Amino acid sequence: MRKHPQTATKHLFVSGGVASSLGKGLTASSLGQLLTARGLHVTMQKLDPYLNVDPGTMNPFQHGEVFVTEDGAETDLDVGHYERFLDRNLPGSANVTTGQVYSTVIAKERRGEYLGDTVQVIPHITDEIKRRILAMAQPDADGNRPDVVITEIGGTVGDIESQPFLEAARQVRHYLGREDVFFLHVSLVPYLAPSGELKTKPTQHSVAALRSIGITPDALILRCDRDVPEALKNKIALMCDVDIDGVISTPDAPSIYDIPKVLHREELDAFVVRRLNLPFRDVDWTEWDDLLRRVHEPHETVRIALVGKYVELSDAYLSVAEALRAGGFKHRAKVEICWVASDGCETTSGAAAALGDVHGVLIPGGFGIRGIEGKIGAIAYARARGLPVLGLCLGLQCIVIEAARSVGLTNANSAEFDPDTPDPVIATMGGTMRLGSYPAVLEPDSVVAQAYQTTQVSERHRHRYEVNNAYRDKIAESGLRFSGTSPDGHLVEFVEYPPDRHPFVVGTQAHPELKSRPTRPHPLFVAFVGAAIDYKAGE
Amino acid sequence: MRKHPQTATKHLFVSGGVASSLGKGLTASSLGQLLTARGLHVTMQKLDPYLNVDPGTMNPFQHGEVFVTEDGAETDLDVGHYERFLDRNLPGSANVTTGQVYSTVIAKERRGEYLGDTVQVIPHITDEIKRRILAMAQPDADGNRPDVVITEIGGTVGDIESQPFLEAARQVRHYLGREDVFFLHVSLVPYLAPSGELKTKPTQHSVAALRSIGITPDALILRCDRDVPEALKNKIALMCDVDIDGVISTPDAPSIYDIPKVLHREELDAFVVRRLNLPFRDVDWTEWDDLLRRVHEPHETVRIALVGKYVELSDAYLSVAEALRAGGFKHRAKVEICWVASDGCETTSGAAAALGDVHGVLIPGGFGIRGIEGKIGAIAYARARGLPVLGLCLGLQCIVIEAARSVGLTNANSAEFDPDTPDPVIATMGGTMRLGSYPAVLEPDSVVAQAYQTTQVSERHRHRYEVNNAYRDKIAESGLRFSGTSPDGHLVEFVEYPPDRHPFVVGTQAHPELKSRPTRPHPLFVAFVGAAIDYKAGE
Amino acid sequence: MRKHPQTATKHLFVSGGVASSLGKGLTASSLGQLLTARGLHVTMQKLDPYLNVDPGTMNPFQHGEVFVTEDGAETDLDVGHYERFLDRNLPGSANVTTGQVYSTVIAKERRGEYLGDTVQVIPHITDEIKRRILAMAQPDADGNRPDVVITEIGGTVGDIESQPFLEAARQVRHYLGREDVFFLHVSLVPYLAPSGELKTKPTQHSVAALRSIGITPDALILRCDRDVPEALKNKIALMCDVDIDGVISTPDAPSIYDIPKVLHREELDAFVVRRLNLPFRDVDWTEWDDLLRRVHEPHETVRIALVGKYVELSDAYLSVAEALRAGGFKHRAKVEICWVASDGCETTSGAAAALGDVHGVLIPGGFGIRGIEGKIGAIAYARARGLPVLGLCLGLQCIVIEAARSVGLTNANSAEFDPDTPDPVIATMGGTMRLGSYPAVLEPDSVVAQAYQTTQVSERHRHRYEVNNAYRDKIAESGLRFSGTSPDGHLVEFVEYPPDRHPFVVGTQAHPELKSRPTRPHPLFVAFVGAAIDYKAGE
Numbered sequence A, B, C: 001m002r003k004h005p006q007t008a009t010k011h012l013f014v015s016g017g018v019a020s021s022l023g024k025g026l027t028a029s030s031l032g033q034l035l036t037a038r039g040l041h042v043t044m045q046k047l048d049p050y051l052n053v054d055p056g057t058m059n060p061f062q063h064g065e066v067f068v069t070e071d072g073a074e075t076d077l078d079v080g081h082y083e084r085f086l087d088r089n090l091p092g093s094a095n096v097t098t099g100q101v102y103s104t105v106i107a108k109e110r111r112g113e114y115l116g117d118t119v120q121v122i123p124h125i126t127d128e129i130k131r132r133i134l135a136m137a138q139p140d141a142d143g144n145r146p147d148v149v150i151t152e153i154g155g156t157v158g159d160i161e162s163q164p165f166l167e168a169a170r171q172v173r174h175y176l177g178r179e180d181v182f183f184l185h186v187s188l189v190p191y192l193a194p195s196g197e198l199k200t201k202p203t204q205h206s207v208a209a210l211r212s213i214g215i216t217p218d219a220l221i222l223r224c225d226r227d228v229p230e231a232l233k234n235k236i237a238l239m240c241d242v243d244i245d246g247v248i249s250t251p252d253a254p255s256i257y258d259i260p261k262v263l264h265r266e267e268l269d270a271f272v273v274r275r276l277n278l279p280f281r282d283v284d285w286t287e288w289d290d291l292l293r294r295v296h297e298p299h300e301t302v303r304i305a306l307v308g309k310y311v312e313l314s315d316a317y318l319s320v321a322e323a324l325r326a327g328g329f330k331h332r333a334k335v336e337i338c339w340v341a342s343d344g345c346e347t348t349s350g351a352a353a354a355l356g357d358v359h360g361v362l363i364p365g366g367f368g369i370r371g372i373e374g375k376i377g378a379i380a381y382a383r384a385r386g387l388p389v390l391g392l393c394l395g396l397q398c399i400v401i402e403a404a405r406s407v408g409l410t411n412a413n414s415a416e417f418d419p420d421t422p423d424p425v426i427a428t429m430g431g432t433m434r435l436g437s438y439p440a441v442l443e444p445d446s447v448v449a450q451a452y453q454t455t456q457v458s459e460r461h462r463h464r465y466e467v468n469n470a471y472r473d474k475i476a477e478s479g480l481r482f483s484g485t486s487p488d489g490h491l492v493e494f495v496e497y498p499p500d501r502h503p504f505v506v507g508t509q510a511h512p513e514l515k516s517r518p519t520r521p522h523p524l525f526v527a528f529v530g531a532a533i534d535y536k537a538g539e
């Protein structure tokens, strides 16, 4: 029945071999999704081997965009997959890093809390990591105790930085025994075109490296570009001392939302459930089948330009792209993304050449960014051409700078991008970095309010520059409305043109793509995709 | 001739295998001695793998006593060997730790100094360590540039914590090339009594472990309890790909001062000089030959009790024992040390049984100590019996408490050892921890002044409790003189009885054993050993 | 009850760390003895990592003397411990070697039996080793199925040559599971005299090396020169993730026969029995208590000289020394062995200086031996002095050469030792190497027959030179009797002098020390020790 006896909290560790970017986090999220559908209270955590105390200092070329929690922690991208697939808000405790662990242990040492012992990588660092891992098992604020904790070990097996985390996982397996701890290992099977053969040797060496630290994998996720032959799975099972049930072929799916279907088809969830002896029920595919219908059988299609610097073949905008696809799903339209370099849009002819074929433009945020002249040039061209535009954070800032350059403020800029500008229409109110959720109030019957269908919202923020309040009345002559603000009205949070000036041009300082889920699309992307569809139909 | 052309600074790394306490630091110090006598400007450094930012938090049962520098840093015991053999004062920079390196790199990360890169154990931590190693090569404050830098890598090859230091050493060998970097490896040759054979396998495994991280030893120091046969040295040389000139048999010498002779006899210094291509001259053995005469051919002998808690077969008092032996050397007397437990001296009969055969008693300092009732009991017994006493730090505190209990203050104690005492004759003036060298003024013609033959001295301090100034006039009725003080007189630094009360009973808050050298004995220990000699002769 | 249900055959693997000669084989034999006394049918096996197909080609300086089985295989020394402690005869299958495994697999490859596969170290070599290991579990020729198979893995963990055998053991643990496979790891705890501390770090590194190949030890045998403190055992248990019940202190016992008492006192056998879930009964100590009474409480003492080349501090004569001690036990006399170099006995004065204080002389066999002039010189001196002499194999040959030089044959020798001798009294009958058991017939009422109390015996042989039948009638004039022969009389097997010529001087071509057991002493050593006792009493 739906009510089951109590059992100990199961730990499921996901580790990666050969390389990073194998979809280890996505596989963990998909397994969490399956286990949730089978009725278990899944909770998730990631361990990051890098020494940065948080990725805010990093550059999006390293690991993609940053993410933000409701308690306001700044975390890795994978927490975004966990949210999007579990449809949950996760604590800042869900992202441990070597930086945090070492700082914590050094601080404890300075206070003498180890009573004069020599502080060592074993036991003290591994003890701190094991404590942080087992803390996830404690009852939540409402007494709901997770049935499975899925922990993703970042990096690659054999990296110097992963040694403490894998040792902590080994000690957890020792403490809790094999009946409670399951190891999932993700590995790459490359295809060599010249000889036309899939090679299993990288997987064998990765599993040998994993065995060399005392971990035996329970199952293998063979990442590949094509479905692995059965003979190769048999060879891997034989060579690696892994149950032939546990070798799971995981070819590159056309979209990330097919991965749960691939894993269920291969019966990974059944294998995990049997091996951990969890109580279960069959997966109710109703919701995700509707989602996959919206994916694979859309009624129409629309092209959207994504304008940025990191667009040079990188997943620096993953959350934005997924929120775009969710918006398409709400309208049952396929959204095709045209990756447009910002610097080709600095000249009006270059902007026309890049954008002229698209049906909409998106200006995402960023940090350490440069060359926003191209972004604003794309805004100018798009407004003249009539394309809808959505500007996120820096997109809003570029919209406001465009409006400044529309009314008299030709040399206007952000103090970030021209510290000597005579018209700093964007300025520090380094100022307070706004992070996390803040409330905002919206103009009644604003386009933003028409989208959200409410006067009150909350959004995740990450920025420190603001619209300079000295220029509101000047730039309003552009026609721009400050259609949403902080509750006191002190801070501008949203801007838009009236529908008769342009059918849809909106910007927000927040990152609404971090509240979107594929089964709960965000209002603004639904609105933007609807406007793009209306443009395509009317054009 | 004495003047030679310029050459690059040579780096000599000393590493250990099989176990710690192999005399790796003493071997490094002896090699520094020999290279100094050959005329080279040797400087020395230690790398500590533990995460403690400094050993002040540790307990003397871990790695022996703590040491203190003139700039006031708190460092490992090995810096004491470096001082005692080079007769130099070393900067706090001479002791790096993993704690310091990680704290530094994490701090630099929080400040964004890596410009958005991912902070990694390689390159960033190894770069910080390599920077800290090469900083030793820079010209000193007077422009004197070291000819050789001898770096001791603490721990054992294969400890998880040593991995960054050995990688930094490997990178230094890569950067500077083999003509500048020399690796000396110290290893253990155990003797198995049942089969009567020395075993080389531990050495082979240690050298293989060292090779597995990219280091090839240039020489081997074979630590043993007996001289290694030549056949075994040949076997080791063959198996380890080491020049047969580089296998150095280093049996346990009767005293640490014979080690330079052992290494010279084996021509280790000649091998190092040839391999590094250093300019040299023959060793002038005059000074050290005189020292070894004072060591091995004394005119008389005296027995001194060392009373403490750590005395249970541990080198927690190494500096004190060596300062005692240096005092004996100044008088050409052998000082034999009887290691006496403090807790056997709590009862007067037990104190008599322990001490009755000795010619003097020494009360050294300590931290985390307990049971000073036994220490004070030993003081009481010794004073009644007429034995000379020297009290260091806690020894002075126990002397003052004994005097308190001599004049009316029977329940008197330190606030450290009885927080509820009605007479806290020792109290916090946690208060300011006095660390390092401080100046002091002495009573003219005091026994302390008679020893030092001056009215002004400076001594290294490590303590935070002080004599309570409220009780000076009360305890002076014991006959105790506050014969040395801070220049303002606010702090008591030395106490003594007049010679007619007891021929010599003196205590000092400082650690004079940290300024002693075997070739420059400290005045107070010369005085104490002279008093013990006078007792033995008169008794 | 004595009759128990059937259970699967348990595998107990014994492995060594740090070094060889740790008593790993003796510990395995003692555990086998305890388990036998608890009523289980123990069988034993050794795996030798070296490539020699059998140790016959080796030199006794490598691993001591060679051993011989009843089916005539030539095996390592440890098979001798297994026999002496189990009182059993073991098959030649009880000694696998890398040489045999590789030769077997290469031969199978040449015959195409792998059907075209690539022959690899994994699986094929490890499969052959695992097959040879599991073959021990098969029912014997009479259907008695062993309850525990104790396999000793030769070498040291981390040797290149041990990698296939430890991998085979790991695969056995995988196939049979943890309930059937138990790992015992023997490790060294060295004592460092200069700092007066036992060091556990070698054990930690050895266990880490063992874990790096996927083996977790169940118990640790800490070999040491002194009883390990309890705090160190606790530290080892904590650091190594080993049950605190499983750390077994095993100090160097005064005799090998005390080891079963040490292991039982530490409750190793109880730990093994509990962990393997074996059915058991209490150990009946009656027999071994009688043996230890004969060991520790003898009525008298006698000194015996052992004359050989390998006597320079090596266990090259272990079986002979143990048979000597068993002979002493039969008479309840302590036998003290004086290790005498052969080459000091070449001169009559040197022989007198070496032997004059002893009560008997033993001349053991050997191969690759030289300098038998010294051995024969010792025989000449001993005969003149009246000391009893026992000559084994080469001892008999030297006796016969002495007799040759007693009757006219001054230049007589073996063709082995002077190929140009004019009187080859010892000659090839390279000839047939006699190996293993052969029957012999004895002269009735010969001293040999008086000892054995029978006319028919069987003994283990290892030699290829024989007494030249052409010289029997010549050398009989010495007084020597060919008191035992092959059944056809063709081969001389024993020689003796009549009791009135010398009270006891006997030689045999065989190695009776390989049929001796401490609880079943061999007749000839009982006789020889009785003669030595009679000499001591009468002298």
Ligand SMILES: O=P(O)(O)Oc1cc[n+]([C@@H]2O[C@H](COP(=O)(O)OP(=O)(O)OP(=O)(O)O)[C@@H](O)[C@H]2O)c(O)n1
Binding pocket: A016, A019, A020, A021, A024, A025, A048, A049, A050, A063, A078, A154, A155, A156, A159, A161, A162, B118, B120
């Ligand atoms: O992505 P996740 O989910 O696994 O999260 C991850 C992925 C990777 N890492 C670590 O960053 C460093 C470089 O990573 P990296 O794989 O990129 O190596 P590299 O030098 O850049 O070579 P490459 O060209 O292959 O990228 C390594 O120490 C990694 O262990 C962390 O902490 N979290």
Ligand SMILES: O=P(O)(O)Oc1cc[n+]([C@@H]2O[C@H](COP(=O)(O)OP(=O)(O)OP(=O)(O)O)[C@@H](O)[C@H]2O)c(O)n1
Binding pocket: A118, A120, B016, B019, B020, B021, B024, B025, B048, B049, B050, B063, B078, B153, B154, B155, B156, B159, B161, B162, C198, C199, C200, C201, C202
């Ligand atoms: O002495 P130095 O000059 O080399 O300075 C030293 C000596 C040792 N260490 C480190 O402390 C830990 C335990 O040391 P440790 O040898 O004592 O092992 P253990 O567990 O206690 O076994 P054991 O019984 O043999 O002592 C290890 O991580 C070492 O790397 C450091 O940083 N500097």
Ligand SMILES: O=P(O)(O)Oc1cc[n+]([C@@H]2O[C@H](COP(=O)(O)OP(=O)(O)OP(=O)(O)O)[C@@H](O)[C@H]2O)c(O)n1
Binding pocket: B198, B199, B200, B201, B202, C016, C019, C020, C021, C024, C025, C048, C049, C050, C063, C078, C154, C155, C156, C159, C161, C162
């Ligand atoms: O005795 P067992 O029962 O373990 O049976 C043994 C002992 C040792 N071995 C192997 O012989 C080689 C040298 O042995 P070895 O320990 O003596 O090293 P080495 O070079 O001589 O240095 P060391 O001075 O310490 O002797 C190694 O390959 C060992 O793995 C074998 O096959 N059986």
Ligand SMILES: Nc1ncnc2c1ncn2[C@@H]1O[C@H](COP(=O)(O)OP(=O)(O)O)[C@@H](O)[C@H]1O
Binding pocket: A016, A020, A021, A022, A023, A024, A025, A026, A027, A078, A250, A251, A252, A253, A254, A255, A256, A259, A315, A318
């Ligand atoms: N099985 C897959 N099929 C298709 N695309 C994929 C798959 N797995 C991952 N991806 C994509 O590859 C990128 C990297 O995957 P990711 O989850 O982030 O691995 P990791 O966290 O270890 O770095 C993701 O943006 C994801 O969308």
Ligand SMILES: Nc1ncnc2c1ncn2[C@@H]1O[C@H](COP(=O)(O)OP(=O)(O)O)[C@@H](O)[C@H]1O
Binding pocket: B016, B020, B021, B022, B023, B024, B025, B026, B027, B078, B081, B250, B251, B252, B253, B254, B255, B256, B259, B315, B318, C194, C195
């Ligand atoms: N070659 C030696 N002969 C005799 N005693 C020794 C020798 N080397 C070292 N010792 C002693 O053994 C102890 C260990 O030496 P130590 O300097 O601490 O080496 P490490 O840095 O590894 O800890 C010291 O107390 C030292 O006095």
Ligand SMILES: Nc1ncnc2c1ncn2[C@@H]1O[C@H](COP(=O)(O)OP(=O)(O)O)[C@@H](O)[C@H]1O
Binding pocket: B194, B195, C016, C020, C021, C022, C023, C024, C025, C026, C027, C078, C250, C251, C252, C253, C254, C255, C256, C259, C315, C318
């Ligand atoms: N625990 C012990 N106490 C005393 N003597 C011992 C002990 N163990 C072994 N020995 C002796 O040391 C020698 C080597 O032991 P051994 O069994 O042969 O180890 P291994 O086979 O691994 O080489 C043996 O001759 C044995 O008599």
Ligand SMILES: [Mg+2]
Binding pocket: A020, A021, A063
């Ligand atoms: Mg990634």
Ligand SMILES: [Mg+2]
Binding pocket: A062
């Ligand atoms: Mg990368």
Ligand SMILES: [Mg+2]
Binding pocket: B020, B021, B063
């Ligand atoms: Mg040390």
Ligand SMILES: [Mg+2]
Binding pocket: B062
């Ligand atoms: Mg230690």
Ligand SMILES: [Mg+2]
Binding pocket: C020, C021, C063
């Ligand atoms: Mg052996």
Ligand SMILES: [Mg+2]
Binding pocket: C062
């Ligand atoms: Mg050997």
